[PDB]
Amino acid sequence: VSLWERFCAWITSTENRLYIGWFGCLMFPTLLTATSCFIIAFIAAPPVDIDGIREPVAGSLLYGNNIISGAVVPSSNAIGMHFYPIWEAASIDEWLYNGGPYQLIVLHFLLGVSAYMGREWELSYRLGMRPWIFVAFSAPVAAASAVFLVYPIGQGSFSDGMPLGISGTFNFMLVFQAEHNILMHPFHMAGVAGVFGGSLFSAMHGSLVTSSLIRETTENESTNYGYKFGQEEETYNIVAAHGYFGRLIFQYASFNNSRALHFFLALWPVVGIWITSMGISTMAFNLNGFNFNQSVVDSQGRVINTWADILNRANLGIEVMHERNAHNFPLDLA
Amino acid sequence: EVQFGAYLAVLLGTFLPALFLVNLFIQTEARKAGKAGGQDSD
């Protein structure tokens, strides 16, 4: 009867086209502002002093870029970790010079993605679902907050944060290799196993369902039209695909349970990306990966090279060349 | 300096295959409206 109850009834209605919910009250204003500023800053945005040395790095399309090289540049080294909104900038020209829109996009992104995650919970509550799709979405939220939030914190500047682009991503990955040795760190190892394993069990499960489909169509029409939507009959012989994989490797390595099978597809990647995103986090605070340089010696004591020493000389090439003007002192403490 | 044959590569790489996929959808809906026998078959 009241105005608030007629507003709570609408905002929590599943009869809307897109469910809004109470998290959409701060998902939609956040992500539309992260979007509408991203499209403008990617297309039309002046160059940005990223190294704090007043050498402005172009990143937008109107200043001679493309899809690959164009990128929303991170904020300045001069700012660093300080909060830099528009009203604390004394003009928009001073805001866009010093890496303004990187903080406006990222902070409205991480609020909107952490609200998109809670929105996946909310609709599962109002639909009668068991709730935990949003726990599986915690794994890219862990990884998005690792390269945009946690790594600028432990390194003390948003300038070490990830550039919102495509070539800026590979500037981020290579400089992160030289300074932290991520490939030898066992948490990037535990998530390469998460996505190689994840793409394995995806294409391994998706093939054994498509292999054992039941005849419901003719050879002229499509294979997919043998599934009517909302039917109650099972659309594939699960005993058939169990007997196949029960002979392809051996018998006891096969899940006859389809529920425990469809749980292992959700376990393996998500655990692999939780562990990986806490690799960037523990390497944000300079707890680097393994270092086996000069580890094998002869009885005389001369250093015998290994593959890690060849990997070290690739890291030394990126270390002596990243931010080639920003350094003045012999050790990259930042 | 960019290659001026790339405009012809991209804008025909967009339009010619994308206008192809539109045609397979329009004749799909015409056959469904063709069999249905009401107000649109003719």
């Binding site: 499209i39 297309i43 493309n66 899809i67 939507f229 909302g230 | 804008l11 967009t14």
Partner: peptide, 30 residues
């Protein structure tokens, strides 16, 4: 002149995302 093509590809991609969400073929039981 060159960046005009890149912008048209980007907003043209966001059009077909708009039509796929709102003008989707709504699936129906029976």
């Amino acid at each position: 002149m060159e960046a005009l093509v890149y912008t048209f590809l980007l907003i043209g991609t966001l059009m077909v995302i708009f039509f796929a969400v709102f003008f989707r073929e709504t699936p129906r039981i029976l």
